Design a protein around this ligand. Structure first.
Ligand SMILES: CC[C@@H]1[C@@H]2CN(C(=O)[C@H](C(C)(C)C)NC(=O)O[C@@H]3C[C@H]3CCCCCc3nc4ccc(OC)cc4nc3O2)[C@@H]1C(=O)N[C@]1(C(=O)NS(=O)(=O)C2(C)CC2)C[C@H]1C(F)F
Ligand SMILES: [Zn+2]
Length: 191
C-alpha cells in the first residue's frame, strides 16, 4: 500500500482560517507510491490523502497525529522517503508519526474549558460544547457531509490549545448533532 501524503493545510495563522492545497491528485498518487515528498510543510493541521481516502492530521507535541481508520498502518511520505509510524493504537483509532520538518505543533490544553472549537478540512471553525471526556455537542447541528473528511482534525479550547482529535460523529437522520474525539490526555499518555 502507498504512503499517506500531505496534500494541503488549514491556515490558522491570521485572523481568517482557510484551506490551502499544496499538491494535486496526480502528484499525490505518485508521491504515495514513492513515499518521497519534497514539498515544504507548514502549520499545525495538514490535509492528508491515501489512494482511497482524504482526512486530516494534527501536530501536537512534535507528533503528527491522525486516525487509524484513515491511515491504517501506513507510512507517511517525507523528503527522505517513507516514514514509519511512531505510534499505532487501533483501540483508540489513533496513529502518529514524527512531525514533519517545518510543521508547527499545538500545545495540549491545560485549562479545563468546556467551550471547544472543531477545525474542519474546509477551515470551518465550529463551536462545540464539551459534554464528556470524549464527546461534545455542535452548537449549530448540520448535515454530516460537512464533517466528512475531517477526522484527524483538532478540537481546540478558547486559547487555541489542543483538547482532542476528531474521531467520529453522532448522527441522527444524516444530521450531525455531536462529535466524538480522542482526548489529548490519551495522546499524552501514549507519548
Ligand atoms: C470509518 C469511519 C469511522 C468509524 C465510523 N465513524 C463515524 O463517525 C460513525 C458514523 C455513523 C458517522 C459513520 N459514527 C459513530 O460511530 O458514532 C459513534 C458515537 C461513536 C462511538 C464509536 C466511535 C468509533 C470510532 C472508530 N474507531 C475505529 C477504530 C479502528 C478502526 O479500524 C479500521 C476503525 C474505526 N472506525 C471508527 O469509526 C468514523 C467516521 O466516519 N469518522 C469521521 C470522518 O470524517 N471519517 S473520514 O475522514 O471521512 C474517513 C472515513 C476518511 C477517514 C469523523 C466523521 C465524519 F464523517 F463526521
Ligand atoms: Zn485550554
Amino acid at each position: 500500500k502507498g504512503s499517506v501524503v500531505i496534500v494541503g493545510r488549514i491556515n490558522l495563522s491570521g485572523d481568517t482560517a482557510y484551506a490551502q492545497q499544496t499538491r494535486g491528485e496526480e502528484g499525490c498518487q505518485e508521491t504515495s507510491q514513492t513515499g518521497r515528498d519534497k514539498n515544504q510543510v507548514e502549520g499545525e493541521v495538514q490535509i492528508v490523502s491515501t489512494a482511497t481516502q482524504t482526512f486530516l492530521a494534527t501536530s501536537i507535541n512534535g507528533v503528527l497525529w491522525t486516525v487509524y481508520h484513515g491511515a491504517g498502518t501506513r507510512t507517511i511520505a517525507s523528503p527522505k522517503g517513507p516514514v514509519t509510524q511512531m505510534y499505532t493504537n487501533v483501540d483508540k483509532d489513533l496513529v502518529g508519526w514524527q512531525a514533519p520538518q517545518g510543521s508547527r505543533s499545538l500545545t495540549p490544553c491545560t485549562c479545563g474549558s468546556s467551550d471547544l472549537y472543531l477545525v474542519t478540512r474546509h477551515a470551518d471553525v465550529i463551536p462545540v460544547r464539551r459534554r464528556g471526556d470524549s464527546r461534545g455537542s455542535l452548537l449549530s447541528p448540520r448535515p454530516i457531509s460537512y464533517l466528512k473528511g475531517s477526522s484527524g482534525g483538532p478540537l481546540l479550547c478558547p486559547a487555541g490549545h489542543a483538547v482532542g482529535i476528531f474521531r467520529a460523529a453522532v448522527s441522527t437522520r444524516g444530521v450531525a448533532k455531536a462529535v466524538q474525539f480522542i482526548p489529548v490526555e490519551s495522546l499524552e499518555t501514549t507519548m
